[PDB]
Design a protein around this ligand. Structure first.
Ligand SMILES: C#CCN(Cc1ccc2[nH]c(N)nc(=O)c2c1)c1ccc(C(=O)N[C@@H](CCC(=O)O)C(=O)O)cc1
Ligand SMILES: C#CCN(Cc1ccc2[nH]c(N)nc(=O)c2c1)c1ccc(C(=O)N[C@@H](CCC(=O)O)C(=O)O)cc1
Lengths: 264, 264
């Protein structure tokens, strides 16, 4: 997409060679924002083929409040393999925080149910947020949430959502998250009888790993193709009842996929 | 400031009429980001006279981990009176969440010290964040946090900061928060022997209350003056040992102040 590619070029031209946790090295910029009008099409990268099966199953895995990769495996998704323990657990990551944020007094908070109820009863609320940044549980998580916090908004019957991504792997992780949240907005809109609006991406440490330089240069040479469209074949009783079979991405003509090594 | 005035005009030009909790009515836009290079000067609004006293004392109050207005009153700061209970208490807001975020296992985390440790021992970390958005304590708070989350970043010996403000009252609150955060960055940098970089502001529901329109346009008819300069007359042993009297704002020649009704 034009926005995605311009961010890449931005990282190349302005990035600061930074040493990273993995000891790999990354070109990095701090602070960036982009807007994606969902009414223009699904923001799935066209300059490289993206794998939707992983994107869809991971999201349904989140909404279930699951933190064990068993479900992912059952559906051939291996993205979380390198971080799960001997038993497949990842600690209280996203899923747990979205559906069961633990209070100090022992209670748990369902942030998705709360959001649904706010969108339906109080759409003008400026407090429609879901946060995965639970400071008290960070040390138990296999990894600290990269897509840490997000906020919904309703204006003129349209549903918007801003995502704050503290750490962003521009090449691999980014295309995945854009598509993931764009999908959530669609599922939320359908459930709350609202039209889809803007999906705004905001990041902190936006970086490109040194061992992805070639792949980047390659992708940067491809002319972006028109954006596909999403079809939701069925309307479930709740945002928690969607199935992989319910989605379809029409008009998706991407350039060949580009393979790149994963940084653990 | 150029960036500030530009946001105001954006809100006016692309805003959407939206009702709000206070029952006042607002003009709102969702998603914005602006950058301030702290090297250029202290980011304090010059198109209207601002009251540094209230800003500085609030920050020191915050860092103390205090959440009772008694301190503020001793120094004639009344900016938090409308929300305090009979005993002057506001609940576990800012100060508390920063100095002692409660965990589910009976621990408490001092996010300020943690961040200081990272800035000195692991400045390349992508996890240097302080969150006030404690989902499990919101009901105890007098008001849900506006400036809910912030991230620090280091590069070329310069410290930068990005803040995510979920709800922003452009006319009243914004000028306070920007001056407040720039102050924090200067304090952090001095404690970590770093120079000041950029303050990146990101807002969710960015709005102007309908009863501030005239005051807004009055302010917009004004030419911003040169940015003041901040002089810190001492290097305390710790970030929590700063006093009001250590800060000097020099060259601050603002246009007349404009009064405007608060929305409780
Ligand atoms: C981000 C994220 C989610 N995930 C996993 C995952 C890994 C690290 C994380 N790190 C942090 N901090 N938070 C996360 O949510 C997170 C999630 C991803 C995993 C792999 C690829 C990847 O290798 N990309 C291939 C996948 C191909 C396939 O699955 O068939 C690609 O080319 O798209 C991308 C994203
Ligand atoms: C942000 C913030 C802190 N605050 C208060 C305050 C109020 C509501 C909030 N709401 C939420 N949710 N979070 C907050 O941080 C927050 C803070 C402010 C309060 C009042 C003025 C105000 O009345 N402005 C006068 C100041 C006069 C003076 O102090 O001398 C003016 O005319 O400018 C400014 C800032």
């Amino acid at each position: 997409m034009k926005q995605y590619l311009e961010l890449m070029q931005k990282v190349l031209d302005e990035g600061t060679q930074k040493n990273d946790r993995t000891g790999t090295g990354t070109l990095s910029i701090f602070g960036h924002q982009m807007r994606f009008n969902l009414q223009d099409g699904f923001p799935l990268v066209t300059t490289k083929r993206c794998h939707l099966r992983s994107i869809i199953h991971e999201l349904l895995w989140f909404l279930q409040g699951d933190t064990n990769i068993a479900y992912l495996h059952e559906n051939n998704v291996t993205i979380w393999d390198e971080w799960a323990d001997e038993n497949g657990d990842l600690g209280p990551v996203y899923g747990k925080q979205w559906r069961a944020w633990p209070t100090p007094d022992g209670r748990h908070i369902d942030q998705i149910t709360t959001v649904l109820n706010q969108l339906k009863n109080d759409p003008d609320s400026r407090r429609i947020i879901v946060s995965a940044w639970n400071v008290g549980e960070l040390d138990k998580m296999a990894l600290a949430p990269c897509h840490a916090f997000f906020q919904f908004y309703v204006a003129d019957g349209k549903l918007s959502c801003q995502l704050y991504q503290r750490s962003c792997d521009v090449f691999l992780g980014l295309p995945f998250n854009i598509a993931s949240y764009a999908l959530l907005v669609h599922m939320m809109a359908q459930q709350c009888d609202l039209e889809v609006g803007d999906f705004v991406w905001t990041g902190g440490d936006t970086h490109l790993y040194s061992n992805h330089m070639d792949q980047t240069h390659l992708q940067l040479s491809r002319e972006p193709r028109p954006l596909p469209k999403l079809i939701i074949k069925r309307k479930p009783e709740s945002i928690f009842d969607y199935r992989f079979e319910d989605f379809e991405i029409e008009g998706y003509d991407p350039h060949p996929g580009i393979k790149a090594p994963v940084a653990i």
